[PDB]
Paper text:
Adenovirus fibres are trimeric proteins, which consists of three different domains: an N-terminal penton base binding domain, a thin central shaft domain and a C-terminal globular fibre head domain. Adenovirus infections are usually initiated by the interaction of their fibre heads with primary receptors, followed by internalization mediated by penton bases interacting with integrins. Here we present the structure of the raptor adenovirus 1 fibre head, which does not appear bind sialyllactose, and show that deletion of the beta-hairpin insertion does not significantly affect the stability of siadenovirus fibre head domains. Like the other siadenovirus fibre head structure, that of TAdV-3, the monomer has an ABCJ-GHID beta-sheet topology with kinked C- and J-strands resembling reovirus fibre head structures.
A high-quality dataset was collected from one of these crystals and indexed to space group P213, with one protein monomer per asymmetric unit. The structure could be solved by molecular replacement, using a monomer of the TAdV-3 fibre head structure as a search model, despite of them having low sequence identity (19 %; as a rule-of-thumb, 25–30 % sequence identity is usually considered necessary for successful structure solution by molecular replacement). The final refined model contains residues 327-462, plus ordered solvent (water and chloride molecules). A beta-hairpin, made up of residues 359-373, sticks out of each monomer. Together, three crystallographically related monomers form a compact globular trimer. In the trimeric form, the interaction interface of the RAdV-1 fibre head contains many hydrophobic interactions, with 23 amino acids from each monomer involved, accounting for 17 % of all residues. The basic framework of the trimeric form is also secured by eighteen intermonomer hydrogen bonds (five of these involve the beta-hairpin arm) and intermolecular salt bridges between Arg419 of one monomer and Asp388/Glu389 pairs of a neighbouring monomer. The RAdV-1 fibre head trimer has a solvent accessible surface area of 16.5 × 103 Å2, with 8.1 × 103 Å2 of buried surface; this means that 33 % of the total surface gets buried upon trimer formation. The calculated dissociation energy (ΔGdiss) is 70 kcal/mol, which indicates that the fibre head is very stable. Indeed, we could not identify carbohydrate ligands of the RAdV-1 fibre head by glycan micro-array experiments and co-crystallization with 2,3- and 2,6-sialyllactose was unsuccessful.
Numbering used by the authors:
A (entry chain A), B (entry chain A), C (entry chain A): 327 to 462
Amino acid sequence: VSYSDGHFLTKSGGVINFRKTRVTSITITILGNYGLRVVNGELQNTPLTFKGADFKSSTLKDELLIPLEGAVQLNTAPSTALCIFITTDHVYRELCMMQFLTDVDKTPFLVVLRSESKHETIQYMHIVTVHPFLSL
Amino acid sequence: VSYSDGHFLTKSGGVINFRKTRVTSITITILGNYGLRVVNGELQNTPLTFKGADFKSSTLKDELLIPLEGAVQLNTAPSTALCIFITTDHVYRELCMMQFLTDVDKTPFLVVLRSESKHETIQYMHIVTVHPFLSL
Amino acid sequence: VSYSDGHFLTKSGGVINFRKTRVTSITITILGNYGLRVVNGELQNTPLTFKGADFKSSTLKDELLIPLEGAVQLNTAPSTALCIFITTDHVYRELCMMQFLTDVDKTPFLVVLRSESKHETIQYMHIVTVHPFLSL
Ligand SMILES: [Cl-]
Ligand SMILES: [Cl-]
Ligand SMILES: [Cl-]
Ligand SMILES: [Cl-]
Ligand SMILES: [Cl-]
Ligand SMILES: [Cl-]
Ligand SMILES: [Cl-]
Ligand SMILES: [Cl-]
Ligand SMILES: [Cl-]
Ligand SMILES: [Cl-]
Ligand SMILES: [Cl-]
Ligand SMILES: [Cl-]
């Protein structure tokens, strides 16, 4: 086993940290600096938060693209996440799938796939929890 | 690779069995005594069933806490499950995320995150199937 | 680590290719010939497509069975997928769980579990993306 740490920058200047754990030809990647905790029987959490400005388009479509910048590519299979989308008028709490992909042009992306498009602008997306990311 | 078996007790006296498979610094945990089968082209299943009494609060909130007792901690990333919630008036079939966490006070918990809160009391939660639990 | 390739035939004559990666007693299986890509900032995809004719019953039930034929069994835990169901009147985009199981009679199946039954006939199911399949 070996480990590598890395990060990406979002368009608004946010930093996404990650840690890759390699066991043979499979890698498992976790995102840092967020998650659930139980503190004296009360659930608390720190989400990973994206702004509408971090998306290619801020409309709450059923496919969303977050272009990233950083030193290295990250290419994964999709993983399930619990996300909260804040619009001006609504709060949408939903399971989604997300996947790290690299564009043919070499740009890293995080892609989020949802069930239902809305004609509303994303103010925030909060990732509450996500299954680890697998790469073969 | 090595393997460890364990269990937890729920508040109502239910036993949750699990098996951990360790490969280097990643552990994969499966829960025992439940699942899907196909028998002469017909799907059958044995769910893992929790009572309302097993939850910290039995209200069908969008965050649920199941306090456990047992010999060892179990700390995992979240995994997706298909659950069935039975209330007095309704049956809710839904994908959820669940995660094993340990309280700062050392109490083991199973946490279930859902999309939509209901002002109803849980009679039962049936776990129909769940993706294996990963721990790094 | 070792690798094995295989395939299954569906009732309509479709071929499902898969690749198994074995690391000790855990196997990770990916399905071939489909997935997401980003091409100059635009998301494209090739789904894995099943016909209504591939199911045991074509009704859009909350449990679906796809009987397969091939040289070897494939038995997995459930994984989350984003699927699109096309009926004559509707398009349903949803997260589902799917699992490869073997019948007591030795027939391989792919089983799909959904949240909500509809009294409609499946024309197509498109698998857009699915988390890799784990077997212990
Ligand atoms: Cl952009
Ligand atoms: Cl977008
Ligand atoms: Cl997942
Ligand atoms: Cl808006
Ligand atoms: Cl309690
Ligand atoms: Cl609770
Ligand atoms: Cl999962
Ligand atoms: Cl009630
Ligand atoms: Cl059939
Ligand atoms: Cl069926
Ligand atoms: Cl999954
Ligand atoms: Cl129809």
